Write a protein that holds these residues in place. Structure first.
Motif, PDB file in Angstrom:
ATOM      1  N   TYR A   1      -5.455 -16.419   4.586  1.00 28.56           N
ATOM      2  CA  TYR A   1      -4.651 -15.838   3.508  1.00 28.56           C
ATOM      3  C   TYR A   1      -4.810 -14.333   3.308  1.00 28.56           C
ATOM      4  O   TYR A   1      -5.928 -13.809   3.274  1.00 28.56           O
TER       5      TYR A   1
ATOM      6  N   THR B   1      -5.182 -13.319  -2.734  1.00 24.60           N
ATOM      7  CA  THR B   1      -4.944 -14.313  -3.775  1.00 24.60           C
ATOM      8  C   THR B   1      -4.318 -13.621  -4.977  1.00 24.60           C
ATOM      9  O   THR B   1      -4.834 -12.602  -5.447  1.00 24.60           O
TER      10      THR B   1
ATOM     11  N   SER C   1       0.749   6.520  -6.489  1.00 18.61           N
ATOM     12  CA  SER C   1      -0.372   7.455  -6.539  1.00 18.61           C
ATOM     13  C   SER C   1       0.124   8.879  -6.748  1.00 18.61           C
ATOM     14  O   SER C   1      -0.318   9.578  -7.668  1.00 18.61           O
ATOM     15  N   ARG C   2       1.063   9.321  -5.908  1.00 19.95           N
ATOM     16  CA  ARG C   2       1.530  10.702  -5.959  1.00 19.95           C
ATOM     17  C   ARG C   2       2.399  10.973  -7.182  1.00 19.95           C
ATOM     18  O   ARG C   2       2.353  12.077  -7.738  1.00 19.95           O
TER      19      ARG C   2
ATOM     20  N   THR D   1       0.824  -1.203   0.000  1.00 21.40           N
ATOM     21  CA  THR D   1       0.000   0.000   0.000  1.00 21.40           C
ATOM     22  C   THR D   1       0.860   1.256   0.000  1.00 21.40           C
ATOM     23  O   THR D   1       0.454   2.298  -0.529  1.00 21.40           O
TER      24      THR D   1
ATOM     25  N   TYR E   1      -2.454  10.097  -9.466  1.00 22.13           N
ATOM     26  CA  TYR E   1      -3.681   9.341  -9.664  1.00 22.13           C
ATOM     27  C   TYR E   1      -4.367   9.083  -8.330  1.00 22.13           C
ATOM     28  O   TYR E   1      -3.834   9.386  -7.259  1.00 22.13           O
ATOM     29  N   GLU E   2      -5.563   8.506  -8.412  1.00 19.32           N
ATOM     30  CA  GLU E   2      -6.274   8.099  -7.210  1.00 19.32           C
ATOM     31  C   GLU E   2      -5.693   6.801  -6.661  1.00 19.32           C
ATOM     32  O   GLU E   2      -5.126   5.988  -7.395  1.00 19.32           O
ATOM     33  N   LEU E   3      -5.832   6.615  -5.346  1.00 17.13           N
ATOM     34  CA  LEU E   3      -5.420   5.356  -4.731  1.00 17.13           C
ATOM     35  C   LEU E   3      -6.300   4.209  -5.202  1.00 17.13           C
ATOM     36  O   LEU E   3      -5.813   3.239  -5.797  1.00 17.13           O
ATOM     37  N   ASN E   4      -7.606   4.296  -4.918  1.00 13.93           N
ATOM     38  CA  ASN E   4      -8.558   3.293  -5.377  1.00 13.93           C
ATOM     39  C   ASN E   4      -8.452   3.055  -6.874  1.00 13.93           C
ATOM     40  O   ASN E   4      -8.796   1.965  -7.346  1.00 13.93           O
TER      41      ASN E   4
ATOM     42  N   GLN F   1       0.860   4.100  -2.543  1.00 11.19           N
ATOM     43  CA  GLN F   1       0.865   5.503  -2.155  1.00 11.19           C
ATOM     44  C   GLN F   1       1.871   6.309  -2.970  1.00 11.19           C
ATOM     45  O   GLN F   1       1.534   7.375  -3.499  1.00 11.19           O
TER      46      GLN F   1
END
Lengths: 240, 476, 663, 129, 47
Positions: free
Chosen positions: D102, D105, D9-10, D2, D14-17, D6
């Motif tokens: 888990y 996947t 993204s920067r 993540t 762009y957007e994270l999602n 991040q």
């Protein structure tokens, strides 16, 4: 030590059996105070009990004549409480049998037998019917009644159901309230069942009319009740 | 119970009946197994091995010079012909200071004596180099040699050595047939007798037979009662009057009911027991039972079977003939296919690590679950296909159990494979055809139908053996 | 809308798979219904089909569908199809308790979910079963884990033989002589919690009677999107998707801290406050209000670096809508005037900022939390806030409390043996508050620590409702005029429910304004509002001296550490005030600051120490050995020395030995 | 991971999602401004050769060390690394121990319908021994 | 043996244990019985 020890043992057993007889006197007193129909339909043990209570109060006044326990618990021979107890047992077994007769039916076994005794003390009063209606049943609270009985609004007829969320729905059939408690209780259960059935059918016909008039904006699905409307529309989507 | 202990000690003398000074050696020759078989039917395979070794060293803790059981229960590049997994095992044998001097005392650096010894299946009997043994491992260190150099002979070499190096009287360490009356002659009319209801175990039938053939005097005068409802009042009065007459009784379903026994064992201990008043207790292995019974009682066990074949056999066993002999072959065939698939799911549970993330509580009720739900499918007339019902079948008997997405994904794929329903031997309706199917279905459950490999099953069983060892068990 | 979006999702499944058969099977999974003109109607499922109850369920709030619930639906429908009950289970608090009732009243039948409570007599269970059987009721007895397995056998065999009778489809049967007719529609379901605590285990054949269903997951999204829907505007579905995405990703990303919480009731709150807030704002201001409201919680909760991270993470969603702002310069300048001159206290833009955040949080919710030491600015923050509150409002009735000052039993009342009821203290407070006068606003503060019992004792107000309970059967609710304040320094012993109850506020201890404070104390003592104050006595000289000493001695003792005990630097200036006063009775400033700092310093490290200090000191220390020799004389202006005395009448008694005037 | 969402993204603003991670066994890409060559991955249940997913057997270990891997991220549902049918998810637990539910996947090529790959019970371990 | 063991209970009270050769002698007593009742009646009566 001698005199006081034997006196203490005797006073102990006496006041013990006395407290038992006294507390069950309170219980039977209250039981026959909540209703008179119990005493009427049960003449024998209630007459025994009222004699018990009369001379109970009498010997209680006799004991109260001397309150100073240091010089008043000298009331020996108080073993009449034993026979009092045996009479209590023989009358309470009968009383339980009469309570079983009164409960005789399935729906009575989801409630305290004490609340059932309240019903058998007063079942005809429609306010009390309304009260225990919500205490017993799941989604109903009460129902409306005729304000005038020429004296009050006592126990006349049902005009409309009142739910938990204050859903107020009138009676297609204005249910008359009677004294045959379980009989008209079954009648009210069938009011629920078949009144809901006919409401379902009417709402279903007007919801088919609504599906036909879907093209103009229908406020009919808002006019309908949420439950029946969503059910009929789920059926509609099944056909879709 | 010592009373039982000295009791069976008497038959070991009584069964002897030998007329010589050969008596005392034969007396003890009965005693050691009479008592060893008296404990071999209550313990677990682990508790057996330690008690054996206990009596082993106790009779007449010597060979383990320096805490060898530690790294024997776990508490390389010098070789090339070996696989790397053997190298890593050997690297364990060559941990910092574990057995390095012994690992070089193997002299494995010469690959010849080790390559052949590892290349020959069952080395210890056929090609075991005698001179190599004299070098490293004479008596028992061979079993430490088999710890890493070839772990394919753990159990057998254990059994062979412990019977050989021991002067244990039992020629074969196991026992004779399940013959139970001879063990029931020594029973006493006051002590209780518990039957451990193992899976697929119902020795009750023999209890009647003996209570008919030998107890002709009291047949049907005794009885048995499963621990039910209010059978407190019923059975206790029966046990009471039966005690006043010295009758017999067996109690099934006890595991169901611990907290009658607190009153039942109380009234039991309240009174001693009358003569000829033999007791019998029966329940599956369960905890929560008052120890007052389990300490003084008889503990006899049987043997649970498994495998698709046995599952299918017992599934059609409860699936009665009128259930088997339905209207059309089609109904019975998909029932046969469903049951094969349900048995496949149930049998997969024997693999804790990989088959499922955890062994869920699949039940025969789930097979009952597939039955009448199918009756409600076939109750109406209409060619009922099976993409939803299998979902249903999967949403229920396993949808509750199978919650994990990996198990969920493995489940749905099994639903798509068994019954295609994706577009991407069987037989006719009679029962004998599916009994024929049970025997055509080979007893050896191949990993093809499962979809696995053979080695980790051995590794999972080896891990279970290490757990047994650990539970058998200012220093280092 | 729940059932609408569910139908929707299934239709998208259909269009993605291009489902062909009319008997479609992902389709036969769901419900079927048909009418009739008998008296009795019918329902249909995959296989099960029976009459309808025509029961009035009453409109209630209803849960969401999930593949777990599809599994459970189908489990129950087949158990019904088989004439055997179900035993769903799993971890506690999974939602299965709500799903059981939901599924029961789905068709509209009774669902009596009870507790296996107080060693249920085999008789009691028999009578419950006898009533339910002929009444045609349904139910469950949760907490099977606690039951005497005595009753377990009794009830297991009642259930199994009753099950066999119903499978025979009899009319009447007998149980403990109760030869009674039966009712067709009857359903038992059972749910317990597996091996977590020590509880009574399940019989073998009784666990064979039923099958089980493991369950583990829930969810939200629907309720949000539904209320954003119901607010007044339309475009809210993908909005709620963004909301829930941001929420769960904040949970995952943001570092785990104990006070860090996104309390469910606070979520529903933020939602419907924004709902009210739309009123009087055009379609464009809709979206700015969303991020500004997210910030309304982002500000007083998250530290600066996580704030930067989070705010960029948000600015991804709407990168063109960054500069909205707050508008309260009126209250800004009110509190500014109060802090500056009306108080005589020293003002600061930063302090006023914290005052404003506190003010708006108090406007939002009744109470909140705050972290800091006492007398460290924050108490003066809420004091200046209530004083600006009486400048902008009528008055503020105010009360102060501490939980651990006394016991909770006298804090809430108890009986005097002789059975005489005694009251608490909050009861008296609320009595005087609701009964004083109306021209006031009512506030109370709680300072101390966290202990679960007393704080859960008053969850009845910490919850959404603000209502009380008392042992003497007394219940008191309050108008919004009554507010709480919760001061705390550490949440070592808090609970997540208590965290979700109220708001939050944090103060980085570096934010306490140092130089304005010390300048205030140097220039003018606080105004003597109370009577009979105590004695109190260029300034730039000692100010510049302290400022120069500040960083140098900080780095000096930073190398050194070494103190005996942990201390802050505020009480050091509290002693520098004693230094100034003993000066009134530059070199003396230095000496007394030295005596203040050298307190917790250790022996062997005394040769680190004052040593590096006389290195850093203006006046060179002539006492080369044990430089602590400093009794400077004011009159003669000499440099330093010591003194001593000792005698016998000083040593007359056993005690009072003259421990000589040691150095 | 993540965090690399991040930073990317920067970098692309762009957007994270928006950012969709995707594995890339071969090399890196440049919508994704950064492609990390990361270590510590071993496949289980199936072997692999260059641009082919094989299936383990009895003599082969249950483990198969994966080739040097790389990664990349993308828009929400753009044309990413490989085909959705050609790719197929395989579980990702913590380590040698299959405990702890888990983490996710990961995609992997299916030579034939995933049916046989589901039956194979393939997975990936972070670390063994 | 020694479930609670401290020198206090030993210093105040009188200690009596026995720990194998007794359980031995009841064995022969019962075995002499089962060996031969003549051996029994001889041994115990004569004793």
């Amino acid at each position: 030590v001698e005199d006081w020890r034997e006196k203490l043992g005797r006073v102990d057993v006496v006041v013990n059996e006395w407290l038992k007889v006294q507390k069950n006197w309170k219980i039977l007193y209250n039981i026959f105070l909540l209703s008179e129909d119990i005493r009427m339909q049960l003449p024998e043990d209630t007459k025994v009990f009222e004699g018990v209570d009369k001379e109970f109060k009498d010997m209680m006044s006799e004991v109260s004549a001397n309150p100073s326990v240091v010089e008043a618990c000298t009331i020996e021979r108080r073993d009449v409480l034993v026979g009092w107890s045996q009479a209590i047992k023989k009358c309470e077994k009968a009383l339980n049998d009469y309570l079983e007769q009164k409960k005789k039916f399935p729906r009575f076994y989801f409630l305290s037998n004490q609340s059932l005794l309240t019903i058998l003390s007063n079942g005809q009063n429609a306010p009390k019917v309304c009260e225990y209606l919500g205490d017993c049943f799941d989604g109903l609270k009460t129902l409306t009644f005729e304000p005038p009985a020429n004296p009050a609004e006592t126990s006349k007829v049902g005009i409309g159901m009142i739910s938990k969320d204050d859903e107020k729905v009138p009676f297609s059939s204005k249910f008359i309230c009677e004294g045959a408690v379980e009989h008209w209780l079954l009648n009210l259960e069938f009011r629920m069942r078949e009144t809901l059935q006919e409401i379902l059918e009417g709402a279903k016909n007007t919801a088919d009319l609504w599906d036909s008039g879907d093209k103009p904006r229908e406020e009919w699905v808002e006019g309908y009740n949420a439950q029946i409307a969503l059910l009929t529309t789920t059926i509609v989507w099944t056909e879709d | 119970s010592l009373e039982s202990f000295i009791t069976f000690f008497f038959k070991a003398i009584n069964r002897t009946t030998v007329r010589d000074e050969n008596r005392i050696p034969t007396l003890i020759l009965n005693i050691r197994q009479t008592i060893y078989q008296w404990i071999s039917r209550g313990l677990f395979e682990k508790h057996k091995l330690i008690f054996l070794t206990l009596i082993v060293f106790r009779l007449m803790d010597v060979a383990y010079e320096v805490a060898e059981m530690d790294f024997l229960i776990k508490c390389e590049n010098t070789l090339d012909w070996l696989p790397n997994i053997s190298w890593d095992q050997i690297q364990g044998l060559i941990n910092l200071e574990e057995f390095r001097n012994f690992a070089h005392q193997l002299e494995k650096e010469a690959p010849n004596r080790f390559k052949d010894w590892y290349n020959e299946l069952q080395p210890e009997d056929q090609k075991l180099p005698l001179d190599w043994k004299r070098l490293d491992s004479m008596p028992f260190k061979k079993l430490l040699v088999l710890r890493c150099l070839r772990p394919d002979r753990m159990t057998i070499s254990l059994n062979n050595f412990i019977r050989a190096v021991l002067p244990q009287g039992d020629a074969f360490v196991e026992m004779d047939q399940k013959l139970e009356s001879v063990i029931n002659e020594d029973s006493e009319s006051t002590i209780p007798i518990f039957f451990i209801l193992s899976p697929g175990s119902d020795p009750v039938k023999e209890v009647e037979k003996i209570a008919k053939k030998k107890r002709i005097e009291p047949g049907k005068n005794f009885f048995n009662i499963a621990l039910g409802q209010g059978q407190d009042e019923i059975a206790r009065r029966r046990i009471e009057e039966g005690n006043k007459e010295g009758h017999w009784v067996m109690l099934q379903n006890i595991h169901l009911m611990p907290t009658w026994l607190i009153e039942l064992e109380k009234i039991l201990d309240s009174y001693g027991g009358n003569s000829e008043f033999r007791l019998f207790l029966s329940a599956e292995p369960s905890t929560g039972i008052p120890i007052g019974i389990l300490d003084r009682s008889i503990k006899l066990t049987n043997e649970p079977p498994a495998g698709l074949k046995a599952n299918m056999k017992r599934a059609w066993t409860y699936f009665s003939k009128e259930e088997i002999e339905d209207k059309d072959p089609k109904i019975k065939s998909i029932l046969f296919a469903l049951c094969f698939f349900h048995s496949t799911l149930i049998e997969r549970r024997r693999f804790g690590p990989k088959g499922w993330n955890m062994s869920y509580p699949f039940n025969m009720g789930d097979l009952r679950d597939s039955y009448l739900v199918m009756n409600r499918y076939m109750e109406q007339n209409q060619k009922v296909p099976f993409n939803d019902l299998i979902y249903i079948f999967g949403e229920i008997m396993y949808g509750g159990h199978i919650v994990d997405d990996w198990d969920r994904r493995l489940c749905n794929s099994y639903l798509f494979n068994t019954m295609h329903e994706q577009l991407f031997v069987p037989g006719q309706n009679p029962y004998e055809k599916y009994i024929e199917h049970i025997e055509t279905s080979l007893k050896q459950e191949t990993p093809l139908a499962y979809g696995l490999h053979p080695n980790a099953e051995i590794g999972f069983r080896t891990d279970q053996c290490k757990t047994l060892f650990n539970t058998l068990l200012i220093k280092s | 809308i729940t059932i609408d979006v569910h139908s929707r999702d299934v239709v998208e499944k259909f269009v993605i798979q291009k489902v062909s058969e009319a008997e479609s099977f992902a389709w036969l999974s769901q419900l079927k219904f048909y009418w009739e003109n008998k008296n009795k109607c019918i329902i249909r499922i995959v296989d099960w089909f029976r009459f309808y109850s025509y029961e009035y369920i009453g409109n209630a709030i209803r849960l969401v569908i999930t593949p777990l619930t599809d599994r459970c639906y189908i489990t129950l429908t087949q158990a019904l199809n088989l004439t055997m009950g179900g035993a769903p289970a799993g971890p506690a608090g999974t939602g299965k308790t709500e799903t059981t009732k939901d599924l029961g009243r789905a068709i509209g039948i009774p669902v009596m979910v009870f507790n296996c409570s107080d060693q249920m007599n085999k008789d009691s269970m028999a009578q419950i079963f006898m009533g339910l059987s002929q009444s045609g009721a349904w139910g469950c007895f949760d907490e099977f884990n606690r039951i005497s397995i005595e009753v377990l056998s009794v009830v297991s065999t009642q259930v199994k033989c009753v099950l066999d009778a119903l499978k025979e489809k009899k009319t009447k049967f007998s149980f403990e002589e109760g030869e009674i007719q039966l009712q067709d529609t009857v359903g038992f379901f059972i749910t317990m919690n597996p091996g977590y605590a020590g509880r009574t285990e399940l019989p073998e054949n009784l666990k064979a009677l039923f099958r089980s269903c493991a369950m583990v997951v829930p969810d939200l999204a629907l309720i949000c999107e539904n209320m954003l829907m119901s607010e007044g505007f339309t475009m809210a579905r993908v909005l709620s998707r963004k909301f829930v995405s941001l929420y769960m990703l904040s949970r995952e990303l943001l570092s785990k801290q104990k006070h860090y919480d996104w309390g469910l009731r606070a979520v529903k709150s933020v939602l419907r406050q924004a709902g009210k807030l739309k009123r009087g704002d055009p379609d464009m201001p809709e979206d700015p209000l969303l991020m500004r409201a997210l910030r309304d919680f982002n500000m007083p909760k998250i530290v600066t670096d996580d704030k930067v991270i989070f705010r960029r993470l948000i600015g991804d969603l709407f990168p063109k809508l960054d500069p909205p702002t707050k508008q309260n310069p009126e209250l800004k300048k009110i509190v500014q005037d109060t802090t500056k001159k009306d108080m005589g206290l020293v003002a600061e833009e930063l302090f006023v900022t914290k005052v404003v955040q506190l003010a708006e949080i108090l406007e939002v919710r009744h109470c909140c939390f705050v972290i800091g030491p006492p007398g460290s600015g924050k108490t003066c923050v809420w004091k200046t806030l209530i004083k600006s509150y009486i400048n902008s409002g009528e008055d503020a009735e105010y009360d102060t409390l501490n939980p651990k000052a006394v016991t909770s039993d006298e804090l809430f009342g108890a009986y005097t043996k002789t059975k005489e009821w005694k009251n608490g203290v909050i009861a008296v407070i609320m009595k005087n508050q609701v009964k004083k006068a109306t021209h006031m606003h009512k506030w109370s503060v709680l300072d101390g620590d966290i202990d679960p019992e007393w704080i859960e004792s008053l969850n009845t107000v910490m919850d959404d409702n603000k209502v009380l309970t008392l042992v003497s059967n007394d219940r008191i609710f309050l108008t919004p005029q009554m507010r709480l304040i919760f001061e705390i320094s550490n949440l070592r012993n808090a609970t997540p429910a208590t965290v979700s109850r109220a708001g939050v506020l944090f103060i980085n201890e570096t934010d306490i304004g140092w130089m304005p404070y010390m300048n205030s104390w140097l220039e003018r003592s606080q105004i003597n509002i109370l009577k009979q104050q105590k004695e109190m006595a260029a300034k730039s000289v000692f100010y510049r001296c302290f400022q120069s000493y500040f960083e140098q001695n900080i780095d000096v003792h930073d190398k050194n550490r070494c103190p005996m005990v942990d201390i802050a630097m505020i009480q050091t200036i509290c002693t520098i005030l004693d230094a100034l006063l003993i000066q009134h009775l530059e070199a003396f400033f230095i000496f007394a600051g030295l005596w203040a700092i050298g307190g917790p310093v250790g022996g062997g490290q005394d040769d680190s120490f004052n040593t590096v200090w006389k290195g850093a000191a203006k006046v060179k220390f002539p006492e080369q050995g044990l430089c602590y020799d400093y009794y400077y004389d004011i009159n003669e202006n000499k440099w330093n020395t010591w003194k001593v005395e000792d005698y016998l009448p000083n040593d007359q008694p056993l005690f009072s030995k003259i421990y000589v005037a040691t150095i | 991971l993540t965090a690399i969402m991040q930073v990317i993204s920067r970098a692309k603003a762009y957007e994270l999602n928006k950012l969709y991670i995707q594995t890339e066994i071969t090399k890196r890409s440049i919508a994704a401004k950064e492609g990390a060559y990361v270590y510590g991955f071993i496949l289980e249940g199936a072997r692999w050769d260059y641009q082919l997913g094989q299936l383990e057997e009895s003599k082969p270990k249950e483990m198969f060390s994966v080739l040097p891997v790389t990664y990349c991220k993308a828009i929400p549902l753009p044309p990413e690394g490989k085909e959705d049918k050609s790719l197929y998810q395989c579980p990702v637990y913590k380590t040698e121990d299959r405990g702890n539910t888990y983490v996710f996947t990961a995609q992997l090529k299916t030579r034939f319908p995933p049916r046989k790959w589901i039956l194979a019970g393939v997975a990936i371990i972070m670390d063994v021994e | 043996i020694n479930p609670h063991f401290r020198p206090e209970i030993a210093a105040q009270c009188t200690i009596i244990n026995f720990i194998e050769s007794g359980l031995e002698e009841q064995f022969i007593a019962m075995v002499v019985n089962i060996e031969k009742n003549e051996l029994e009646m001889a041994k115990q009566d004569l004793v």
